[PDB]
Amino acid sequence: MLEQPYLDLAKKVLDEGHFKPDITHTGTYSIFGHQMRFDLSKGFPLLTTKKVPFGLIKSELLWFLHGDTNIRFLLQHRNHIWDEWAFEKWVKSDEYHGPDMTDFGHRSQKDPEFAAVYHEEMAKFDDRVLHDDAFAAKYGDLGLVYGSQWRAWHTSKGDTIDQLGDVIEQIKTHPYSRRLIVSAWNPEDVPTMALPPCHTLYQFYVNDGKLSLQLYQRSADIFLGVPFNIASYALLTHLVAHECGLEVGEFIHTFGDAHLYVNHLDQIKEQLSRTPRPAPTLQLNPDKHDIFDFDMKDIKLLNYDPYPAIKAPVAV
Amino acid sequence: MLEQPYLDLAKKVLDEGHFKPDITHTGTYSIFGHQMRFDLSKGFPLLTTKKVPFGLIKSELLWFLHGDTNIRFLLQHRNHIWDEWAFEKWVKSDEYHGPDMTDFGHRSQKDPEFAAVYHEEMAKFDDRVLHDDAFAAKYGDLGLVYGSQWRAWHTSKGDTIDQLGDVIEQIKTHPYSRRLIVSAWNPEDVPTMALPPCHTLYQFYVNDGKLSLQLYQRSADIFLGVPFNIASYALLTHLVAHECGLEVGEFIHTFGDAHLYVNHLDQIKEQLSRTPRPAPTLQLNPDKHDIFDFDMKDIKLLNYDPYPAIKAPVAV
Ligand SMILES: O=c1ccn([C@H]2C[C@H](O)[C@@H](COP(=O)(O)O)O2)c(=O)[nH]1
Ligand SMILES: O=c1ccn([C@H]2C[C@H](O)[C@@H](COP(=O)(O)O)O2)c(=O)[nH]1
Ligand SMILES: [K+]
């Protein structure tokens, strides 16, 4: 089946993944160097052995394509994947004058009392960003995240470079280029960042009128992250191919350090006992071609019939 | 055998490599996305089915580690791998007042007369760089090449960053880091470069006291380039592991666009009929540990018994 490479990766990590401790104090089982490809003409690689929220994937990817770096857009689409990173800024800023939120991550996980007060200052924060423009501009802006790295790379001369927009033109005028690359890794910023980009760099390739894309992911969470990671890039490949009038090819996903956090074992095993169902189909808007102007309704998934969602804890 | 992954790659390109035209007007057979690993505790992956000049590999790698960007160092070790790039600068500069060298590449290949006058201005040039300091500093300095990207990345604040030196310290103080990355790809420079780095980015990884390294190569010449490419990185892995007092693990080589130029077919087939011999052994200087101060005699290859060298044309 289409998603088999994912299940195979999981099994492999359980079979030969050596224990490797990580900063979160949790502990993982990892491997270094792995590659899996997906033939996109066979369907969309959105996992059927577990329910994955495509809406969250669409809204975040579009957020990226717009070159946006402000959470507000996401909150407007009920997407809370990036909230924590912004909330941190708020909590640490001197303008914050409320309950102490020191390491609200594991604390809210190990404390029932805190896991409500924390969930209050957060909802409070999300309200200010959505309504208070001055607040949104100050605390709702992440700064260095995919949207600005892809479309607004800052140069030494003080300008900005639209990597993605440029690369798309190169594909149109020089499809056989072996330099169709986009990097999110900047040696200058990396040491001062809280989370240096996981999806380090990707390359496009064209042959026989078909667009393929390879992604180099330096670190990956087999259970929680990868299911999303695959759909984001399999989707970007379609969008870029839509814009360039090409056919879709393969999505090659390359891993540096792929891992399973020890607290997800039973969950991954449970999923592995499920039998993949036929994959869904993607449907992009034919009358609209500028993918940078795309919006939710311009992308639709058909025939996604997944197994029930599987719950698992986070790693902290 | 140790080098089998290389032979397997070659066969695969001959079997399923679709024709894909390239800028050099030559024409290639390519594939997108491939990965091969080499267990470095089994020997040094220097091809035995064809003679490869290790000396050229040592001298170029050391040139890189020193953060050097001037050809002089190479010429002093009889290494002419980078000459053309510098020679171009000379020929195009107004200070050049001699025979016309327009596209001296294919011209020297399609003309017997020219393939001597060109080989004269070149030897002349190599003499000036080696003896004329002012000339060396002006024309012998490549500027943006691996040595400066690895150890002197220019920031917007006008400073310089030693990526490699920093990463080596991170390994020593945080071996389990999933951020042990070095990038040679800078979105600001790429569009103005004659040859954007082929070896785009690499990552280190540690487990059980063993250092592994994965390389992402965006473009590769299966016949002429890869045999070198493999030894350079299998060697850097040893040097970095020497410096950090770790054991050696695997060298994972990841390809974006791997290709065979149509004029190397008979040569690759011929090599494929040869049977790999036992791989050589590397030997680094035990009393010397600062790899940045390493020199030729500090690295030695033992038991390399290759088949005769195979001749093939260049692509232009
Ligand atoms: O899109 C994402 C974002 C994060 N992670 C995971 C990778 C690691 O589990 C953790 C980041 O830890 P570091 O690799 O930065 O050290 O988050 C993913 O798999 N995919
Ligand atoms: O170390 C190197 C340097 C160059 N090449 C090859 C790759 C391509 O054949 C050509 C560069 O063409 P572009 O990919 O830049 O377009 O040189 C290698 O394989 N290895
Ligand atoms: K980069």
PDB file of N, CA, C and O in Angstrom, chain A residues 271-296:
ATOM      1  N   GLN A 271      -0.748   0.616  16.211  1.00  0.00           N
ATOM      2  CA  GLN A 271      -0.990   1.067  14.847  1.00  0.00           C
ATOM      3  C   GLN A 271      -0.500   0.034  13.835  1.00  0.00           C
ATOM      4  O   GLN A 271      -1.167  -0.238  12.832  1.00  0.00           O
ATOM      5  N   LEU A 272       0.649  -0.567  14.124  1.00  0.00           N
ATOM      6  CA  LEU A 272       1.231  -1.569  13.243  1.00  0.00           C
ATOM      7  C   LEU A 272       0.362  -2.812  13.054  1.00  0.00           C
ATOM      8  O   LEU A 272       0.612  -3.594  12.148  1.00  0.00           O
ATOM      9  N   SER A 273      -0.637  -3.012  13.907  1.00  0.00           N
ATOM     10  CA  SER A 273      -1.511  -4.178  13.767  1.00  0.00           C
ATOM     11  C   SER A 273      -2.715  -3.865  12.872  1.00  0.00           C
ATOM     12  O   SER A 273      -3.583  -4.713  12.650  1.00  0.00           O
ATOM     13  N   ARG A 274      -2.778  -2.627  12.398  1.00  0.00           N
ATOM     14  CA  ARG A 274      -3.852  -2.188  11.526  1.00  0.00           C
ATOM     15  C   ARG A 274      -3.432  -2.388  10.062  1.00  0.00           C
ATOM     16  O   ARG A 274      -2.242  -2.383   9.733  1.00  0.00           O
ATOM     17  N   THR A 275      -4.412  -2.590   9.189  1.00  0.00           N
ATOM     18  CA  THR A 275      -4.148  -2.817   7.772  1.00  0.00           C
ATOM     19  C   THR A 275      -4.508  -1.555   6.992  1.00  0.00           C
ATOM     20  O   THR A 275      -5.650  -1.098   7.039  1.00  0.00           O
ATOM     21  N   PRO A 276      -3.529  -0.954   6.293  1.00  0.00           N
ATOM     22  CA  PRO A 276      -3.766   0.261   5.516  1.00  0.00           C
ATOM     23  C   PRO A 276      -4.909   0.129   4.533  1.00  0.00           C
ATOM     24  O   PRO A 276      -5.121  -0.930   3.951  1.00  0.00           O
ATOM     25  N   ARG A 277      -5.691   1.192   4.419  1.00  0.00           N
ATOM     26  CA  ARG A 277      -6.828   1.230   3.510  1.00  0.00           C
ATOM     27  C   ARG A 277      -6.404   2.039   2.289  1.00  0.00           C
ATOM     28  O   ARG A 277      -5.356   2.684   2.300  1.00  0.00           O
ATOM     29  N   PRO A 278      -7.192   1.999   1.207  1.00  0.00           N
ATOM     30  CA  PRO A 278      -6.814   2.766   0.014  1.00  0.00           C
ATOM     31  C   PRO A 278      -6.676   4.268   0.304  1.00  0.00           C
ATOM     32  O   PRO A 278      -7.521   4.866   0.973  1.00  0.00           O
ATOM     33  N   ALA A 279      -5.606   4.865  -0.205  1.00  0.00           N
ATOM     34  CA  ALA A 279      -5.302   6.277   0.026  1.00  0.00           C
ATOM     35  C   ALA A 279      -6.252   7.247  -0.636  1.00  0.00           C
ATOM     36  O   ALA A 279      -6.813   6.955  -1.692  1.00  0.00           O
ATOM     37  N   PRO A 280      -6.431   8.428  -0.024  1.00  0.00           N
ATOM     38  CA  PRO A 280      -7.306   9.495  -0.515  1.00  0.00           C
ATOM     39  C   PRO A 280      -6.741  10.135  -1.781  1.00  0.00           C
ATOM     40  O   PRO A 280      -5.625   9.817  -2.208  1.00  0.00           O
ATOM     41  N   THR A 281      -7.489  11.081  -2.335  1.00  0.00           N
ATOM     42  CA  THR A 281      -7.101  11.784  -3.549  1.00  0.00           C
ATOM     43  C   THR A 281      -7.127  13.286  -3.282  1.00  0.00           C
ATOM     44  O   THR A 281      -7.999  13.771  -2.574  1.00  0.00           O
ATOM     45  N   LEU A 282      -6.141  14.007  -3.802  1.00  0.00           N
ATOM     46  CA  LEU A 282      -6.078  15.446  -3.627  1.00  0.00           C
ATOM     47  C   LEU A 282      -6.796  16.120  -4.797  1.00  0.00           C
ATOM     48  O   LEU A 282      -6.856  15.573  -5.898  1.00  0.00           O
ATOM     49  N   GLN A 283      -7.307  17.325  -4.572  1.00  0.00           N
ATOM     50  CA  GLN A 283      -8.017  18.048  -5.619  1.00  0.00           C
ATOM     51  C   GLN A 283      -7.754  19.550  -5.490  1.00  0.00           C
ATOM     52  O   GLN A 283      -8.230  20.187  -4.551  1.00  0.00           O
ATOM     53  N   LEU A 284      -6.970  20.102  -6.413  1.00  0.00           N
ATOM     54  CA  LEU A 284      -6.640  21.527  -6.395  1.00  0.00           C
ATOM     55  C   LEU A 284      -7.536  22.328  -7.343  1.00  0.00           C
ATOM     56  O   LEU A 284      -8.049  21.784  -8.319  1.00  0.00           O
ATOM     57  N   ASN A 285      -7.702  23.622  -7.067  1.00  0.00           N
ATOM     58  CA  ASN A 285      -8.540  24.504  -7.888  1.00  0.00           C
ATOM     59  C   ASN A 285      -7.943  24.749  -9.274  1.00  0.00           C
ATOM     60  O   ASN A 285      -6.896  25.389  -9.409  1.00  0.00           O
ATOM     61  N   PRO A 286      -8.633  24.296 -10.329  1.00  0.00           N
ATOM     62  CA  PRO A 286      -8.181  24.449 -11.714  1.00  0.00           C
ATOM     63  C   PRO A 286      -8.187  25.869 -12.274  1.00  0.00           C
ATOM     64  O   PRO A 286      -7.339  26.210 -13.104  1.00  0.00           O
ATOM     65  N   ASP A 287      -9.132  26.691 -11.833  1.00  0.00           N
ATOM     66  CA  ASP A 287      -9.232  28.063 -12.318  1.00  0.00           C
ATOM     67  C   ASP A 287      -8.256  29.004 -11.606  1.00  0.00           C
ATOM     68  O   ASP A 287      -8.071  30.153 -12.017  1.00  0.00           O
ATOM     69  N   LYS A 288      -7.617  28.520 -10.549  1.00  0.00           N
ATOM     70  CA  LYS A 288      -6.679  29.344  -9.808  1.00  0.00           C
ATOM     71  C   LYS A 288      -5.305  28.717  -9.941  1.00  0.00           C
ATOM     72  O   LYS A 288      -5.137  27.527  -9.685  1.00  0.00           O
ATOM     73  N   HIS A 289      -4.328  29.500 -10.395  1.00  0.00           N
ATOM     74  CA  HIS A 289      -2.975  28.983 -10.590  1.00  0.00           C
ATOM     75  C   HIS A 289      -1.860  29.611  -9.759  1.00  0.00           C
ATOM     76  O   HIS A 289      -0.788  29.020  -9.624  1.00  0.00           O
ATOM     77  N   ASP A 290      -2.080  30.808  -9.223  1.00  0.00           N
ATOM     78  CA  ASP A 290      -1.048  31.431  -8.403  1.00  0.00           C
ATOM     79  C   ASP A 290      -1.161  30.792  -7.028  1.00  0.00           C
ATOM     80  O   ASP A 290      -2.010  31.182  -6.228  1.00  0.00           O
ATOM     81  N   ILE A 291      -0.308  29.809  -6.756  1.00  0.00           N
ATOM     82  CA  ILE A 291      -0.358  29.114  -5.479  1.00  0.00           C
ATOM     83  C   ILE A 291      -0.102  29.992  -4.263  1.00  0.00           C
ATOM     84  O   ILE A 291      -0.484  29.634  -3.147  1.00  0.00           O
ATOM     85  N   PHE A 292       0.526  31.145  -4.470  1.00  0.00           N
ATOM     86  CA  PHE A 292       0.792  32.049  -3.354  1.00  0.00           C
ATOM     87  C   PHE A 292      -0.492  32.768  -2.923  1.00  0.00           C
ATOM     88  O   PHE A 292      -0.574  33.311  -1.818  1.00  0.00           O
ATOM     89  N   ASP A 293      -1.496  32.736  -3.794  1.00  0.00           N
ATOM     90  CA  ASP A 293      -2.784  33.360  -3.517  1.00  0.00           C
ATOM     91  C   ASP A 293      -3.804  32.315  -3.128  1.00  0.00           C
ATOM     92  O   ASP A 293      -4.971  32.635  -2.925  1.00  0.00           O
ATOM     93  N   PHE A 294      -3.369  31.063  -3.045  1.00  0.00           N
ATOM     94  CA  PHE A 294      -4.262  29.975  -2.680  1.00  0.00           C
ATOM     95  C   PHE A 294      -4.826  30.163  -1.278  1.00  0.00           C
ATOM     96  O   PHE A 294      -4.226  30.841  -0.429  1.00  0.00           O
ATOM     97  N   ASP A 295      -5.980  29.550  -1.048  1.00  0.00           N
ATOM     98  CA  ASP A 295      -6.663  29.615   0.228  1.00  0.00           C
ATOM     99  C   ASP A 295      -7.342  28.275   0.476  1.00  0.00           C
ATOM    100  O   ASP A 295      -7.577  27.517  -0.462  1.00  0.00           O
ATOM    101  N   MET A 296      -7.668  28.004   1.738  1.00  0.00           N
ATOM    102  CA  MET A 296      -8.315  26.765   2.166  1.00  0.00           C
ATOM    103  C   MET A 296      -9.169  26.044   1.131  1.00  0.00           C
ATOM    104  O   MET A 296      -8.799  24.973   0.662  1.00  0.00           O
TER     105      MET A 296
END
